[PDB]
Automatic annotation (TrEMBL), chain A:
<feature type="domain" description="RRM">
    <location>
        <begin position="1"/>
        <end position="68"/>
    </location>
</feature>
<feature type="compositionally biased region" description="Basic and acidic residues">
    <location>
        <begin position="255"/>
        <end position="262"/>
    </location>
</feature>
<protein>
    <recommendedName>
        <fullName>RRM domain-containing protein</fullName>
    </recommendedName>
</protein>
Automatic annotation (TrEMBL), chain B:
<dbReference type="GO" id="GO:0015934">
    <property type="term" value="C:large ribosomal subunit"/>
</dbReference>
<keyword id="KW-0689">Ribosomal protein</keyword>
<comment type="similarity">
    <text>Belongs to the bacterial ribosomal protein bL33 family.</text>
</comment>
<dbReference type="GO" id="GO:0005737">
    <property type="term" value="C:cytoplasm"/>
</dbReference>
<keyword id="KW-0687">Ribonucleoprotein</keyword>
<dbReference type="InterPro" id="IPR038584">
    <property type="entry name" value="Ribosomal_bL33_sf"/>
</dbReference>
<dbReference type="Pfam" id="PF00471">
    <property type="entry name" value="Ribosomal_L33"/>
</dbReference>
<protein>
    <submittedName>
        <fullName>Putative 50S ribosomal protein L33</fullName>
    </submittedName>
</protein>
<dbReference type="GO" id="GO:0003735">
    <property type="term" value="F:structural constituent of ribosome"/>
</dbReference>
Length: 262, 112
């Protein structure tokens, strides 16, 4: 995991007081570079179910910087706020008709995390889309709204001369669109936590990939050794039909591999 | 143990039905070709039959040794291959060996 940020000099995991084969829950990661360590400390580490769904908390020993353990839930709140903002803007357009951008945007509010205090809607937009233009141009919000001409300075000037028009939808279509927007934002949230560990790294030989696999899975034992487990009580060991079936399966697999090659 | 020197002769049908009769002939007539006109049930009448040229043992002990150690498995794998190429194990209308093995890996039912 931590190779994504630079060269890792060492990783150590403290054993449990009562079971040296298990961990107490603490580890130390020593990096080659200060910048790499500082980049690594920024986000917490979310683990899958097989690792008990734990969220690992990181603490830099040279600067006291800590990971942002509330990132996931704050982003979930931001996504809910964005969906609410879209619904509010659509309702405002349905009531007052087409509206200018700089006046419509000031009618939209979000609820802060975690206690849900009303706020001017400017943070969810920049945490989920980066800007109001991104919000409008990214799907499925461009299926709800249509921007029309009559840096931050460019953004403000560009919005100061627009009118937001609605796409006339039914209740069911709008509800489906809102659910779709929520799902897509959720996927965006998961991507940044599950970035791939081979990003910007050289390819690995087949032997190296097998060594990587062996840390998690063991290859099946050879079938020639396995055949001896057929008990004499019910089986005839080394039976002709059984061995011919094995040969036919091997031939079929080789033929399929040849087809794949060609 | 019989001590007769008579030669065994197999008369195959000339109708290509694979039907045969069997008899014996004197050793003096080794190079004499026997031919007869006899009934052939494959075609339902009398056709010609002609004598043919007719150009180790796998015992119980050898079978047991192979199946317990599998050091000369090819001998029986060849018989399995011949059966497979001929048309055994075709899944249908076959009471004897419809399948190579059951789902659990046994070669059943025992038909021999």
């Amino acid at each position: 995991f931590f190779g994504k940020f630079g060269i890792v000099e060492q990783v150590r995991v403290l054993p449990h007081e009562r079971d040296p084969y298990q961990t107490c829950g603490t580890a130390y990661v020593c990096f080659r570079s200060r910048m790499a360590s500082l980049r690594a400390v920024r986000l917490p580490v979310h683990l899958p179910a097989s690792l008990h769904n734990r969220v690992l908390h990181l603490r830099h020993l040279g600067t006291d910087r800590t990971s942002d353990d509330l990132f996931y839930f704050r982003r979930q709140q931001a996504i809910s706020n964005l969906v609410a903002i879209a619904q509010q803007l659509y309702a405002y357009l349905e009531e007052r008709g087409p509206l200018p951008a700089h006046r419509a945007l000031r009618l939209l509010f979000e609820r802060s995390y975690p206690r849900l205090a009303w706020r001017q809607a400017g943070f969810s937009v920049r945490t989920c889309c980066g800007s109001w233009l991104g919000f409008f141009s990214r799907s499925p919000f461009n299926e709800l709204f249509y921007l029309a001409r009559e840096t931050d300075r460019e953004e403000n000037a560009m919005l100061e001369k627009m009118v937001i028009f609605p796409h006339l939808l039914s209740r069911e279509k709008l509800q489906a669109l809102l659910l779709r927007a929520g799902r897509l934002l959720q996927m965006d949230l998961q991507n940044e936590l599950s970035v791939h560990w081979r990003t910007d790294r050289p390819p690995l030989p087949d032997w190296t990939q097998k060594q990587i696999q062996l840390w998690q899975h063991q290859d099946p034992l050879p079938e020639e050794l396995q055949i001896w487990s057929r008990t004499k009580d019910y089986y005839k060991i080394h039976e002709e039909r059984f061995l011919f079936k094995l040969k036919l399966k091997k031939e079929r697999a080789q033929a399929k591999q040849e087809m794949k090659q060609q | 143990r019989s001590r007769s020197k008579r030669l065994f002769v197999q008369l195959k049908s000339a109708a290509m039905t694979n039907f045969c009769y069997v008899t014996r002939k004197s050793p003096e007539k080794k190079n004499f070709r026997i031919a007869l006109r006899k009934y052939d049930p494959g075609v339902n009448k009398h056709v010609m039959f002609y004598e043919a040229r007719l150009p180790k043992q796998i015992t119980l002990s050898l079978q047991r040794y192979i199946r317990w150690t599998g050091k000369q498995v090819k001998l029986l794998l060849d018989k399995v291959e011949k059966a497979w190429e001929y048309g055994r194990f075709q899944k249908y209308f076959d009471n004897q060996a419809p399948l190579l093995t059951d789902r659990r890996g046994r070669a059943v039912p025992r038909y021999k």
